Amino acid sequence: SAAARRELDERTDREIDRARLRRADNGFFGAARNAETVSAAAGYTVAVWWRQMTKSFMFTTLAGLGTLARDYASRDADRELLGAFQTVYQVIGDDLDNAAPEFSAVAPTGPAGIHYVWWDDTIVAPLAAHVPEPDRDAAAAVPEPIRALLANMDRLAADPLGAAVQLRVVETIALDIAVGFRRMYGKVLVDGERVFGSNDQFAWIDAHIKAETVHAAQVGMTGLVTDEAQAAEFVRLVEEYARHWSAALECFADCLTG
Amino acid sequence: SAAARRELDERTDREIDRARLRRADNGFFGAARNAETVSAAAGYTVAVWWRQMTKSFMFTTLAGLGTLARDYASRDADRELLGAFQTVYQVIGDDLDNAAPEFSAVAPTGPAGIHYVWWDDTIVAPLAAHVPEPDRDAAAAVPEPIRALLANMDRLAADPLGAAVQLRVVETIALDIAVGFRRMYGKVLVDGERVFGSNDQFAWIDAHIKAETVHAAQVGMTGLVTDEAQAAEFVRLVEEYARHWSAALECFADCLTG
Numbered sequence: 227s228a229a230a231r232r233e234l235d236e237r238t239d240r241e242i243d244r245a246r247l248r249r250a251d252n253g254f255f256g257a258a259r260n261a262e263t264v265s266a267a268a269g270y271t272v273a274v275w276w277r278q279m280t281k282s283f284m285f286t287t288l289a290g291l292g293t294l295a296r297d298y299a300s301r302d303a304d305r306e307l308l309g310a311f312q313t314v315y316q317v318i319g320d321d322l323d324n325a326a327p328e329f330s331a332v333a334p335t336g337p338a339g340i341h342y343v344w345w346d347d348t349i350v351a352p353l354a355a356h357v358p359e360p361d362r363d364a365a366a367a368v369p370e371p372i373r374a375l376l377a378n379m380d381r382l383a384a385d386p387l388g389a390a391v392q393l394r395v396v397e398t399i400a401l402d403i404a405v406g407f408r409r410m411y412g413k414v415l416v417d418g419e420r421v422f423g424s425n426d427q428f429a430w431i432d433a434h435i436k437a438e439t440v441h442a443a444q445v446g447m448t449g450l451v452t453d454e455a456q457a458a459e460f461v462r463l464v465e466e467y468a469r470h471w472s473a474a475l476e477c478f479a480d481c482l483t484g
Numbered sequence: 485s486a487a488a489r490r491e492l493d494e495r496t497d498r499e500i501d502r503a504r505l506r507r508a509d510n511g512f513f514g515a516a517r518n519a520e521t522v523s524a525a526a527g528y529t530v531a532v533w534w535r536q537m538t539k540s541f542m543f544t545t546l547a548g549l550g551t552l553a554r555d556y557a558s559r560d561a562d563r564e565l566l567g568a569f570q571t572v573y574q575v576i577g578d579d580l581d582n583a584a585p586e587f588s589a590v591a592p593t594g595p596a597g598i599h600y601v602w603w604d605d606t607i608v609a610p611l612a613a614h615v616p617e618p619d620r621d622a623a624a625a626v627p628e629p630i631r632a633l634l635a636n637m638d639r640l641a642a643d644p645l646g647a648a649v650q651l652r653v654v655e656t657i658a659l660d661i662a663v664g665f666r667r668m669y670g671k672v673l674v675d676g677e678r679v680f681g682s683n684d685q686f687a688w689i690d691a692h693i694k695a696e697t698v699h700a701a702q703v704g705m706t707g708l709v710t711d712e713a714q715a716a717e718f719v720r721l722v723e724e725y726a727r728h729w730s731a732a733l734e735c736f737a738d739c740l741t742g
């Protein structure tokens with residue numbers, strides 16, 4: 227339980243390395259290179275996929291926290307478990323209640339600020355006007371990779387380590403995705419005009435960029451892990467979850483290169 | 485779904501009326517009358533029971549929030565559900581992370597401030613020194629009424645309406661319990677001396693008094709309820725939960741009058 231914590235963290239980054247999730251390796255982040263004016267339709271398709279992915283992420287992570295809590299009503303928890311418990315609760319509050327100042331400063335109030343709602347409202351909606359009603363059945367269909375990620379989430383919703391796994395993996399990729407979104411949606415043209423013209427139209431993306439970059443410079447999630455039996459399962463779950471995340475982001479990449 | 489909300493709330497207070505939970509009706513709050521120097525042992529017994537009751541309350545309510553969340557990953561939720569979702573998350577943050585200013589101002593930092601921890605540390609511990617190691621097996625035994633409340637909590641942990649039920653019932657009785665605790669522990673004598681001498685030794689109790697009184701003057705939980713099928717079940721669950729809460733508080737009362 228001593229260097230064990232250090233090895234778990236280093237192994238987890240190894241799993242994320244291997245899953246091809248790093249800035250350099252995942253095809254989606256190369257969307258920067260795809261100056262090819264992202265089609266409004268391509269932007270809509272990814273935006274609608276992302277809406278469900280982030281909605282599921284938030285709800286199944288809160289569900290995963292509830293699952294842990296179920297167990298600790300009875301079992302006595304060390305001060306270290308309780309602190310990681312608190313951390314998970316705090317971190318989840320960003321997506322559900324804009325708890326962090328980088329978000330509350332700018333996000334809409336109340337349920338309008340739930341990040342899958344805020345995203346649906348300022349990204350999915352503008353692009354819908356520029357996409358035909360028949361064309362919107364291309365997103366109504368979620369590719370197997372994206373459906374596999376959502377089902378991994380559903381499983382982790384019921385797993386005593388699911389919150390820890392989802393937050394640990396997503397926090398490492400969150401900035402690259404948010405920068406990928408600012409690049410790709412900055413290249414959506416309607417007869418040569420940016421659908422997303424002004425800076426304020428990017429509020430969601432830039433609050434995440436800000437929140438995430440300052441985070442990665444001021445440094446645990448694995449604090450929930452106690453037995454080496456748990457650490458083994460954590461890595462196993464991380465392997466599965468990171469892999470699904472990468473192939474889902476690959477669908478974003480293929481979408482940009484039809 | 486219109487006056488339906490109003491009737492649900494009024495019926496819920498009727499159920500709490502009937503369960504004999506109001507200040508006037510539940511035997512525990514009459515502890516004020518029990519000037520009979522509360523025995524340290526009596527204080528210890530109730531404190532240890534309360535520790536588990538509040539620990540279970542917090543964890544099974546968070547668990548109940550996770551259960552709701554499980555469902556809403558997939559199902560589309562109206563802006564009203566989402567707002568009640570946010571409210572439950574906020575309210576739970578008091579007990580888990582001293583979210584409200586009345587608490588963060590005064591509570592210990594980090595896991596030390598989780599209210600069942602903070603209570604164990606400043607109420608259970610002082611009284612333990614004044615209670616013999618053999619005598620502490622009177623609390624190690626939880627009376628059926630208190631065990632029945634804990635099991636109701638465990639069931640509600642897995643119920644899509646459990647959080648709503650627990651928070652709705654507990655918020656109506658929270659001030660009376662906290663005042664009952666300030667009265668009863670102000671009357672614990674060790675050879676004629678207050679075990680709890682100074683005002684600072686009452687920090688936990690008084691933060692709750694403050695947080696709860698200001699709350700009851702600045703006015704929903706049932707926002708989670710949609711169908712009349714849910715409202716019916718809500719009242720049913722409230723009937724069961726309030727009844728268990730009252731008999732558990734009756735065990736506190738009997739304990740003070742051995």
Ligand SMILES: CC[C@H](C)[C@H](N)C(=O)O
Nearest residue numbers: 280283321341342396400
């Ligand atoms: C998957 C979650 C990402 C990183 C971000 N928190 C959001 O609101 O979508």
Ligand SMILES: CC[C@H](C)[C@H](N)C(=O)O
Nearest residue numbers: 538541579599600654658
């Ligand atoms: C049952 C919960 C009570 C009212 C209080 N919130 C506590 O910390 O114990």
Ligand SMILES: [Fe+2]
Nearest residue numbers: 320321341434
């Ligand atoms: Fe977010």
Ligand SMILES: [Fe+2]
Nearest residue numbers: 578579599692
């Ligand atoms: Fe509390």
